[PDB]
């Protein structure tokens, strides 16, 4: 019929109010014979003596709840952890009132911990809510404290999963560093201006100083920081026009402890209505058993719902519907410019003054024009020629009086075993070069043509370390960022569509065989080949993957593996020497080859009628107009003219 309560308080006025609230808890609960006994302790500079003293005293008093309510700790660690672990050894619930570290939401470590203040991941949730206001989808992340940086990043990922959007860049490091200008320069080249900050005040001041040196506070920059980032000397170096958030009544400990004590009293009276009400023993000495109602009492406290604001513990045991305010740095005087509701944002009448120009939202998503195009050595579409004297291309004229528009291309001399690193600017022309020139003329941008370090289209292959599949070739370069837009005879398949985007294909053809002067794949002598009929294909090309997909041609996959050639030129030369007997390859290329060389002959079957298109990056505004331009080129006689240039002609 008595309830013992242990508390840790130093300020005597707050302890007096705590005792007053404990006394007033027995007011609205009637004249029942339940009693509330109070126990309080003060601070000591150490953390082991405080831990052992509090544990032994509140164990001997046989208390039910424990509180921590001291913001102004000279120690910057903010550690109630010994109290939590020791009172969790007996599954006796503990209540936090000040600490806001996101580590305390994890209940695998802190078995019996609850608090009435939200960790900083809620600020990330509010930021995601703000993203719903101005229609922003590209962000840059930088979190220093790796103890909670992973938690903040995971919360942001959970937020973004609903829209299925991914951050442009994330960063974690060791707090206390200063040379962070390299990462700032890395982020400068990107398109997004959304900068997310969550770090210590030392790191905040350091990065503010570095960014002020680098001049990244101009117009178009999106700034958004948390509460910890604008206090102390960090506020001193804060660039004007920044947006800050506020924890309402997060420091007036009076009403905070009052609400906590009221909740505790109501929960205790609610539990008193139940059966099997045991008590914690003097577990200080020789009591190794847990409280058999430990989880029971914890779950009773978890279901604690109230209406007198509303206090409600989530599955993480944290308070929801917290009110946040929005502050702006107007000439380095904080001004309230907005508030955050339980799930809504309500801006006030105060103007939104930004570091740059307008008060309207600056679209901090930059644009791109200089495109780094990658292409491959294709015999009828992409020609290779060394320059005449120095970076110059001989202006040869076609038989129709049309000058040949060449382009200065930079690529290696030969393969790595032959030519390790020998790249010279050369002259490239053909079909795709003309197509790219037309694309550049039609639209408004610039470009830079360069070659691919190897001659393979690109395949997903396990790297010998980490047992992880990796790509190479054109897709390997494009995904590495060194390329921007693949323009080449790109074979459209299912693997590529998942990783990168396409437009309407500009080619229409299938697959066939080059022979020298069988009837297609239906030849029984090719169903079970021998050393005589030699059919080969290009190593690490899309055709090999296509044939590997259908296991019904496993023997063919087991035969072509012994004679895969690097390039189509090698296979054509070898079959011209009659060292080969068949060559599975595209139709248009082999038709142009048969026009060039009269001895080249094709077979009959025309299967797998796919197309060639333009590989792209992920969802970008360089897609809709690109596909519209491709369609507009297909509709009129432009394709016929390009065929007159290269495809239609015969030799």
């Amino acid at each position: 019929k008595i309830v013992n309560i242990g508390a840790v308080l130093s300020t005597r006025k707050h302890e007096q109010m705590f005792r007053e609230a404990v006394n007033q808890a027995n007011k609205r609960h009637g004249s029942w014979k339940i009693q509330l006994n109070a126990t309080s302790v003060t601070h000591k500079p150490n953390a082991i003596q405080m831990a052992l003293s509090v544990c032994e005293d509140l164990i001997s008093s046989q208390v039910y709840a424990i509180l921590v309510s001291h913001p102004p700790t000279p120690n910057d660690h903010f550690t109630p952890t010994p109290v939590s672990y020791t009172a969790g050894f007996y599954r006796i619930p503990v209540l936090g009132l000040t600490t806001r570290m996101s580590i305390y939401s994890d209940k695998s470590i802190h078995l019996s911990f609850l608090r009435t203040v939200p960790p900083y991941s809620h600020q990330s949730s509010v930021w995601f809510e703000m993203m719903r206001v101005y229609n922003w989808n590209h962000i840059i992340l930088l979190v220093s404290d790796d103890h909670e940086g992973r938690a903040a990043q995971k919360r942001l990922e959970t937020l973004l999963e609903e829209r299925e959007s991914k951050a442009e860049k994330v960063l974690q490091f060791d707090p206390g560093t200063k040379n962070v200008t390299a990462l700032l320069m890395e982020a400068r080249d990107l398109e997004a201006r959304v900068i997310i900050l969550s770090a210590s005040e030392d790191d905040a001041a350091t990065v503010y100083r570095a960014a002020a040196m680098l001049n990244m506070t101009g117009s178009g920059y999106v700034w958004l920081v948390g509460e910890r980032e604008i206090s102390g000397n960090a506020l001193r170096y804060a660039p004007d026009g920044i947006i800050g958030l506020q924890l309402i009544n997060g420091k007036n400990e009076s009403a905070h402890i009052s609400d906590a004590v009221g909740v505790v009293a109501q929960a205790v009276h609610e539990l008193l209505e139940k059966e099997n009400i045991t008590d914690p023993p003097r577990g200080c000495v020789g009591n190794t058993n847990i409280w058999k109602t430990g989880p029971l009492f914890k779950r009773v406290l978890m279901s604690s719902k109230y209406a007198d604001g509303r206090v409600e513990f989530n599955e993480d045991g944290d308070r929801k519907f917290a009110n946040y305010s929005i502050m702006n740095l107007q000439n380095r005087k904080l001004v309230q410019v907005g508030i955050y509701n339980g799930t809504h944002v309500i801006p006030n009448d105060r103007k939104i003054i930004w570091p740059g120009g307008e008060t309207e939202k600056p679209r901090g998503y930059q644009m791109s024009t200089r495109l780094k195009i990658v292409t491959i050595h294709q015999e009828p579409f992409v020609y290779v020629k060394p320059t005449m004297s120095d970076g110059t291309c001989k202006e040869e004229f076609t038989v129709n009086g049309d000058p040949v528009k060449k382009v200065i291309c930079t690529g290696p001399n030969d393969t790595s075993p032959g030519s390790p690193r020998h790249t010279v600017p050369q002259c490239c022309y053909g079909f795709c070069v003309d197509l790219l020139i037309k694309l550049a003329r039609t639209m408004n941008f610039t470009y830079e043509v360069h070659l691919v370090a190897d001659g393979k289209f690109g395949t997903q292959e396990r790297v010998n370390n980490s047992n992880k599949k990796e790509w190479n070739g054109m897709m390997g370069e494009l995904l590495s960022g060194q390329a921007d837009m693949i323009v080449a005879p790109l074979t459209i398949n299912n693997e590529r569509a998942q990783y990168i985007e396409f437009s309407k294909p500009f080619k229409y053809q299938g697959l066939t065989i080059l022979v020298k002067k069988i009837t297609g794949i239906n030849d029984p002598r090719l169903r079970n080949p021998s050393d005589k009929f030699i059919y080969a294909t290009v190593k690490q090309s899309s055709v090999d993957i296509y044939f590997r997909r259908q296991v019904e041609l496993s023997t063919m996959y087991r035969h072509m593996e012994k004679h895969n050639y690097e390039s189509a030129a090698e296979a054509i030369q070898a079959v011209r020497d009659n060292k080969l007997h068949a060559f599975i390859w595209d139709s248009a290329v082999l038709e142009f080859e048969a026009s060039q060389k009269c001895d080249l002959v094709t077979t009959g079957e025309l299967f797998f009628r796919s197309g060639f298109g333009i590989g792209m990056r992920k969802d970008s505004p360089w897609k809709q107009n690109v596909s519209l331009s491709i369609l507009k080129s297909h509709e009129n006689g432009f394709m016929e003219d390009l065929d007159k240039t290269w495809v239609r002609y015969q030799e």
């Epitope: 509460e227 206090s231 102390g232 506020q246 380095r332």
Partner: antibody, heavy 119, light 114 residues
């Protein structure tokens, strides 16, 4: 109406330290700015420092950056200025004032303490 | 520190007359983005804390009678009393309120005599 009450008169030996208190009431203590000003008798007030209670942001005068320190107590809504290494030049009247801000735009010091003389 | 120049240093007038007190700042107190002057006029009487008289170099406080009139912009400012009363006898100071122009400084002051 907001009220700011300062501590009583102090007689301090030269080179010693004094810590003045300024209790505030009648307004949002957490979301306002408080300034300490030094006013010698017959002289205009000299701005010493300002502090924001909501973020603990501190900014001192360069003449007093190494001389004065500011602290606040949210439970009591009382401002504090600790003046150390006191010299005869510090024989003056110190005042604490609350900033007046309208529409988010500061318009001047609207509230004042009664003043404290340090000898 | 922006140098605040107040003129005249002191003056004596009979009741009912009109007076004019000028304030000059070494730098423009007007911020171009918002076009507002960070100047504040004050009334300081003997033995009392100074009372905020006019802010923004043109706006009177609610308690300030219409007889007070503050003018001037940029670097030069003026405080004018159309109908001088005996109660107005005080030393009036103009002080800048520009946050980007820290620290806050005061002019020499003008003593009003009757």
């Amino acid at each position: 109406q907001g009220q700011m009450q300062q501590s009583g008169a102090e007689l301090v030996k030269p080179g010693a330290s004094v810590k003045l208190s300024c209790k505030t009431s009648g307004f949002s203590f957490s979301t306002s700015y408080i300034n300490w000003l030094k006013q010698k008798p017959g002289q205009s007030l000299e701005w010493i420092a300002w502090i924001y209670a909501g973020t603990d942001g501190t900014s001192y005068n360069q003449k007093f950056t190494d001389k004065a320190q500011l602290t606040v107590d949210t439970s009591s809504s009382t401002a504090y200025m600790q003046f150390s290494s006191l010299t005869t030049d510090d024989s003056a009247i110190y005042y604490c004032a609350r900033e007046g801000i309208y529409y988010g735009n500061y318009a001047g010091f609207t509230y004042w303490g009664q003043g404290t003389l340090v000898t | 520190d922006i140098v605040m120049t107040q003129s005249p240093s002191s003056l004596a007038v009979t009741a009912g007359e009109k007076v004019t007190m000028r304030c000059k700042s070494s730098q423009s107190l007007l911020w171009s983005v918002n076009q507002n002057n960070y100047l504040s006029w004050y009334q300081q009487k003997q033995g009392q804390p100074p009372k905020l008289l006019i802010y923004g170099a043109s706006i009177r406080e609610s308690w300030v009678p219409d007889r007070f009139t503050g003018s001037g912009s940029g670097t030069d400012f003026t405080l004018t009393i159309s109908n001088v009363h005996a109660e107005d006898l005080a030393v009036y100071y103009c002080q800048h309120n520009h946050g980007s122009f820290l620290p806050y400084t005061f002019g020499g002051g003008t003593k009003l005599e009757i």
